[PDB]
């Protein structure tokens, strides 16, 4: 399990630690989309932070079931529900909470359990692509993981009205990789 920088948006040097955690607050109304991202271990974005992601880079192909775990780090007094839904490859990000509610989803009550782990049934970087003039064995299997505020963030006087969450990912034991491919932006300088 490595920390998945889902919140890969701030770049300002001193806010880089912020990429590790995204937040939830009272201000967010029921149904609102909290966050979203794809199940693309090797491609740019969130997965680059995970160790899995970095290792996928030294390989050309791969496939297996993944597994993301969410950790609520808010005050102990807070409670509420988050809907976490997975839209297989092809299925477009669900319009709203209710439509996402019909897909493979999980209601998460961080009032009961501080952690929850989602399994991504399958992802396969096998479909070849020869775009520009540089051939890249790409995904297309961009499975999607959406997260909606099933209920709002509830808290008693005395507790902060914001809390963060941490994404941790890894692959199941059925994971595999093929074709050693050394590639890197970081190299030994002269």
């Amino acid at each position: 399990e490595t920390i998945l920088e889902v919140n890969n948006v701030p770049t300002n040097a001193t806010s880089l630690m912020e990429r590790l955690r995204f937040p939830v607050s009272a201000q967010a109304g029921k149904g609102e989309l909290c966050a979203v991202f794809r199940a693309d271990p090797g491609r740019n974005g969130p997965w680059q932070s995970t160790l899995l992601g970095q290792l996928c880079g030294y390989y050309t192909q791969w496939s297996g079931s993944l597994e993301v775990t969410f950790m609520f780090t808010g005050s102990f007094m807070a409670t509420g529900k988050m809907l976490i839904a997975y839209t297989p490859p092809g299925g477009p990000l669900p319009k709203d909470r209710a439509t996402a509610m019909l897909g493979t989803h999980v209601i998460w009550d961080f009032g009961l359990q501080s952690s929850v782990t989602l399994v991504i049934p399958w992802i396969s970087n096998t479909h070849y692509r020869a775009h520009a003039r540089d051939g890249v064995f790409d995904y297309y299997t961009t499975g999607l993981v959406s997260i909606w505020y099933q209920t709002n963030y509830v808290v008693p006087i005395g507790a902060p009205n914001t809390a963060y969450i941490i994404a941790l990912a890894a692959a199941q034991k059925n994971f595999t990789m093929k074709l050693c491919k050394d590639a890197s932006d970081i190299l030994q300088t002269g």
Partner: antibody
Amino acid sequence: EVKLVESGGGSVKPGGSLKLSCAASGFSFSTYGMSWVRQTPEKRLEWVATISGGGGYTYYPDSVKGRFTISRDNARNILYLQMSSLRSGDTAMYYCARRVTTVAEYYFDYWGQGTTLTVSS
Amino acid sequence: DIVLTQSPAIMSASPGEKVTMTCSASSSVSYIHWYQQKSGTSPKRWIYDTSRLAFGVPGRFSGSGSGTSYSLTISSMEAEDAATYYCQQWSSNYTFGGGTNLEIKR
């Protein structure tokens, strides 16, 4: 207290360029998105730009997208708005506003006291 | 390209009676917010998400509306409220309303 106090402006001839700035006080500036709004001689209110909590995204309306550019420097807690190729329709009183998050939408909590821009020959 | 029309533009209450200002939209809208502007001073925050009141606002102010017609209601009216009240929409192009000059009757 939360204070938004802005600076710049005056008379400018049409075609000239100008830069407006707003200074923040008494709230963590980086954690908020910040917008400018203009008021024509005490009647009409028109949104002109927003900036994300960090660098991130900028957003503009279709009356201004092209000439104005909104910026922030999160070391001195200060917004910036440079306006180039200023026109006669740009005369107004410009406020800097803080944008908070609600259940779904956004809302402007505090407004500064504004600077006045008169574009005229 | 989403316009908000406010009626009426000018109003006069006794005071001690109620006041109903209206913000109508050209298309269906999710929520509406309200500001206040007294003379010489900038706009102040008043109502958000249609029915929630900003910390300062007296409890005598109210908010409702659904779809395309929303309204700010005041009961009862007091000489300290006289200002211009603007509505605002947050769905697409962030538009303001024309305002409503609320005034004291004598």
